[PDB]
Amino acid sequence: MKIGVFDSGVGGFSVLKSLLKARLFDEIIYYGDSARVPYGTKDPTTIKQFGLEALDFFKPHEIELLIVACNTASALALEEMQKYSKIPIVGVIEPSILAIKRQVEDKNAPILVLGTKATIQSNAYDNALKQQGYLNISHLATSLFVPLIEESILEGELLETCMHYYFTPLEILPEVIILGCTHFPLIAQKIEGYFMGHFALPTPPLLIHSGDAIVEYLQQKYALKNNACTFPKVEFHASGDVIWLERQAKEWLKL
Amino acid sequence: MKIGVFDSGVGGFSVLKSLLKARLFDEIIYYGDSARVPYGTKDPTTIKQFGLEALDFFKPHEIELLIVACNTASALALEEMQKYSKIPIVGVIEPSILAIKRQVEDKNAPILVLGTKATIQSNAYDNALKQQGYLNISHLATSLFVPLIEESILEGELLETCMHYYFTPLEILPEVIILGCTHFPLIAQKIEGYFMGHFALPTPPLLIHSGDAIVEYLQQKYALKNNACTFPKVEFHASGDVIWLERQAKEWLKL
Numbered sequence A, B: 001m002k003i004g005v006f007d008s009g010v011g012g013f014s015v016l017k018s019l020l021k022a023r024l025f026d027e028i029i030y031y032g033d034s035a036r037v038p039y040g041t042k043d044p045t046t047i048k049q050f051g052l053e054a055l056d057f058f059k060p061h062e063i064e065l066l067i068v069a070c071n072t073a074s075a076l077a078l079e080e081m082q083k084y085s086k087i088p089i090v091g092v093i094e095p096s097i098l099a100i101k102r103q104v105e106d107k108n109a110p111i112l113v114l115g116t117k118a119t120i121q122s123n124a125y126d127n128a129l130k131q132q133g134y135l136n137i138s139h140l141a142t143s144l145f146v147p148l149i150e151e152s153i154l155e156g157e158l159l160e161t162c163m164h165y166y167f168t169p170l171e172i173l174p175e176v177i178i179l180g181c182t183h184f185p186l187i188a189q190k191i192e193g194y195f196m197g198h199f200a201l202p203t204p205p206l207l208i209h210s211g212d213a214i215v216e217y218l219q220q221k222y223a224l225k226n227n228a229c230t231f232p233k234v235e236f237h238a239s240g241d242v243i244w245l246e247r248q249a250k251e252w253l254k255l
Ligand SMILES: CC(C)Cn1c(=O)n(C)c(=O)c2c(-c3cncn3C)n(Cc3cccc4ccccc34)nc21
Pocket: A010, A011, A012, A013, A014, A017, A149, A150, A151, A152, A182, A183, A186, A248, A252
């Protein structure tokens, strides 16, 4: 199968990695709208229109399915993109809801959603979660995590001080934390260590990764299988510097 | 006189505040490309073209001069903008160079240039200072200041730790600090406080503010006298969050 993956930029790599490791696809066309990144700081009408525009980018590629790796575009643009697209478009929020259902039998478990401002203000996560019977849902816009991560602040005092800034106010101690942004997997264990260091817990909260969750959905929904070729064809495309993006793929993805 | 102000988003307000206090112009059309903010994290090509697209936006408005309030656009897009424009275009780098040339006779004074990644990478400031005979020039990309300032992290521990992270590796004690980004006046006193508090500085460093510097330039170059109408007509446009932009203008600029 030939598919598209769309993200606001390089962050989508966290999803593409899961897809690659699972060997789902013979061909993948990755588009990063990196001239306009971030999306998370911006308004719904702007982001919806970004998502429609990404649809036009894909048209000459004859993809059969579009993955929207971006949790912000997933939260805000996806309904509008699906409305004008014949092929299916799969976002990263719904697959995470299905993963939570499999992994979190206790409907009362405190679940913390972390995301960009736009993702958190949409309440996409909370709404889906409530519909499936969840009763203790909390949310937090950890906005500064995105540029810290862009600047490779993946440990140390500055990261620790930032986490502390966002997490100290929380009144509830989550048993489940949804990593509802492309960037946040890169600080997954530091978030785990934060809660383990700051509270007496025998195990860290369960972390939900958007990549692994969409992999599980794609396998099940499309009978996709971990035996697409050994050397998938993958093209990178960007509205900003595509050579830099390709250089990133080569360094971090081996491609 | 009707003129235009361009910036990547709201940060240009720091320049606009200075323009308004100086009563230089009867009417100002402000445009922020806030669908695509920030520019500072991006590349020459992408930023040159943003700045040519800003020319297009000003065409129906019949402006007589354009001020590029963005330090990043000034650094990367100015020449290209000027190459095509029929009206004078004034950016925020050259006026800062001439402000320094006026206040700082000592060619060995240690001047420190703070900007976005793109601004610093261009060496637009360093080149201009060197041509003016300056021999002691350091630069730092203080990239996380921008998002921290956007999230109103204007004091406290997170700012202090961010500043520590950028300022600690510095091998020269500055006598001149260029606030080479729209956003950095909002923490000017905090920056001055970090240097006075952690080092043995005899007296505060001379801080160069892009807006005060452009004003000085505009007055002198254009023989503008500060005798424009007491309440100028000012319009606010943006590529998104325009409503938000207009709110910010009323709350913060008195407009
Ligand atoms: C995302 C996984 C698949 C690969 N990866 C990584 O494991 N680390 C530890 C990085 O530091 C990194 C970076 C990186 C290079 N410079 C900064 N970093 C963080 N990239 C590229 C990248 C850049 C910016 C944001 C990103 C967000 C998500 C994924 C990759 C990102 N990919 C990176």
